[PDB]
Design a protein around this nucleic acid. Structure first.
Lengths: 54, 206, 146, 101
RNA sequence: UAUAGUUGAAGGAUUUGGAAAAUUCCGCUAAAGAGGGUGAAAGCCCCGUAGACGAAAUGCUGACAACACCUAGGAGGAUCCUGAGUACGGCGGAACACGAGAAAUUCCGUCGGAAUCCGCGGGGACCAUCCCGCAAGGCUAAAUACUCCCUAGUGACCGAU
């Protein structure tokens, strides 16, 4: 998904070397989860990372 | 050396003494030539440019194929041979200015002044004064002093009433005692200078 | 010397060499370059030291050495530099210098023993070659590692 | 400009030295002014409404102000006109012994 | 002070010409001999320049008024506060002149997860003594880069391919 509603994790990109550093491109998406949570008392549905779930 | 003295009519009072370490030095020559060329050739303005192949408002589409027409091969409308193409190795903006060792400057000034005194051309005047800047009197000042050729005037400091009458025929040109340069002496024949300006010169020149 | 009579110092200005202006200069039609070959295109020539194909010299022989991170080299003044401070002046690695003798004391001033001194100075520096102390105390000076 | 429509004038230059007259028309915006009997020119007029015939006519042609003085009338000579602050207008004031135009 | 302005010195004659600013006499002015124009090449014909003066209206920049806001010592050390899924570790990548290399320092993704002044970070793996600092909350003029545009200038820069 796009972002986290609470913090600002977002997708990005970096290379990927393999045993002879042939450089290509990759994607690093942040772990994300859809959960129903309270906002103003109105339960929403939104993306929250699995690192702000403690 | 020794030089005579006059005021504007009071003619031939006692003389004046000047040291031999500055005004008697049997001038070197190559220094003078080189300092003249440098000083003068430091007055340029390098502002001049020219468009070249990648700057002309042209295009990179070939005229036509590489073959077929039997014609010669061409890469771009705009290019050196075509009329209306870029230039190869045209003039760009540059600098032209450059300095010398610090000693030869002083040797040059000393040599110039010693040369001019060597032929009785420094005329030491006592003191010039004008209440108002009346141009006509200046002419009479020189007429009394018998200086008609191209001349140069050295003044002490802001006694401007003696400079505001130096927009004469260009036979004269005015300058204080802090800006005496090489050219502004070599270019002239006779030189006028008050008595205080002489000492002031003999200060800055150590 | 007057404006309209300038003369440069003789033999002090050459002329130029503009190449490729006609077969009489001697440098037209291949601009003093000869026939074909990659020495004769625009911007030809190989990099420096390259050698065709041979393994060049700098790879034919081995690497050696390292560099101590904290070496200290001094600013040696031998013995005759001292021989102008006639008799008693407290030579010092300081405003002694201040005379056009030794600027940029690298890591303190050394003193050496070449080649002959006849004075009675008093020397203060940061090291001494064993023969130098003998020369100083031979003419009867002093020393101090200060 | 220093020259008006009705103002007698001496001519200094150009084949009409010393000859005077009356300025007829004034063309500023190109600095041309025409006088009487100074710039006669022959026009091969073609048969027209005006002058049904085609006579060779004679009219005057413009002259540049650098060829025109002004006149004294109080005296009768030429003055390198200067300006004075007479009462609240700028009436031209002659040089050469103080006239008033 | 920027945007309209005002004032501003001194020449006649002669020879060639279609035409003089040209030539030859004799004069004059300059704090003004920079330049442009006029029937050919002008210090004294014209526009100007050196100077001197000038704004009803509008804008900017100062200054000092008024108002707004902000800021106090000394002595005590019983107890309290000093930025948390943060620092940091493994893993995979990037940033530092530093391509994992013996690799400190800085970030990013994932998992694991500290102490609280007798405390914590750093001084190029790591440990000990010493020394220097207090992260995980914000703001901050000047010295620097550029010129579509306006004003005034300059050029051993071009002169209809």
């Amino acid at each position: 998904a796009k972002v986290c509603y609470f913090t600002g994790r977002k997708t990005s990109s970096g290379n990927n070397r393999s045993h002879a550093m042939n450089s290509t491109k990759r994607t690093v998406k942040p772990n994300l989860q859809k959960v129903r949570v309270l906002i103003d008392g109105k339960p929403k549905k939104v993306w929250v990372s699995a690192r702000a779930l403690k | 050396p020794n030089v005579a003295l006059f005021k504007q009519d009071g003619t031939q009072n006692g003389e004046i003494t000047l040291n031999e370490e500055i005004f008697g030095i049997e001038p070197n020559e190559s220094v003078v030539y080189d300092a003249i060329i440098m000083q003068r050739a430091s007055l340029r303005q390098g502002t001049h440019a020219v468009k070249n192949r990648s700057a002309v408002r042209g295009g990179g589409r070939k005229p036509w194929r590489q073959k077929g027409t039997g014609r010669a091969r061409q890469g771009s409308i705009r290019s050196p041979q075509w009329r209306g193409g870029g230039v190869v190795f045209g003039p760009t903006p540059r600098s032209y200015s450059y300095k010398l060792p610090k000693k030869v400057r002083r040797l040059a000034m000393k040599s110039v002044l010693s040369d001019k005194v060597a032929e009785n051309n420094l005329v030491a005047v006592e003191g010039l004064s004008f209440d108002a800047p009346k141009t006509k009197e200046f002419k009479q000042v020189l007429a009394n002093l018998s200086i008609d050729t191209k001349v140069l005037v050295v003044l002490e400091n802001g006694n401007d009433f003696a400079a505001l009458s130096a927009r004469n025929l260009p036979n004269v040109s005015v300058v204080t005692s802090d800006n005496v340069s090489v050219l502004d002496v070599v270019s002239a024949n006779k030189v006028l200078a008050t008595q205080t300006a002489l000492t002031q010169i003999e200060e800055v020149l150590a | 010397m007057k404006l309209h009579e300038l003369k440069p110092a003789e033999g002090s200005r050459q002329v130029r060499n503009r190449v490729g202006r006609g077969t009489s200069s001697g440098n037209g039609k291949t601009a003093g370059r000869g026939q074909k070959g990659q020495k004769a295109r625009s911007g030809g020539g190989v990099r420096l030291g390259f050698e065709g194909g041979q393994t060049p010299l700098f790879r034919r022989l081995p690497k050696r050495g390292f560099t101590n991170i904290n070496r200290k080299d001094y600013a040696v003044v031998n013995l005759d530099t001292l021989n102008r401070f006639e008799d008693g002046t407290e030579v010092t690695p300081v405003v002694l210098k201040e005379a056009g003798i030794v600027k940029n004391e690298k890591a303190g001033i050394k003193v050496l023993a070449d080649g002959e001194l006849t004075k009675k100075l008093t020397v203060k520096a940061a090291k001494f070659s064993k023969s130098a102390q003998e020369a100083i105390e031979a003419a009867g000076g002093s020393i101090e590692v200060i | 400009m220093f020259v008006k429509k009705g103002d007698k004038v001496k001519v200094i230059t150009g084949k009409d030295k010393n000859k005077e007259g009356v300025v007829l028309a004034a063309f500023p915006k190109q600095d041309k002014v025409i006088v009487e009997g100074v710039n006669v020119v022959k026009k091969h007029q073609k048969p027209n409404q005006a002058a049904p015939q085609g006579g060779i006519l004679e009219v005057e042609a413009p002259i540049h102000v650098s060829n025109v003085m002004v006149i004294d009338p109080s005296n009768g000579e030429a003055t390198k006109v200067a300006f004075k602050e007479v009462d609240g207008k700028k009436v031209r004031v002659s040089k050469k012994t103080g006239e008033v135009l």
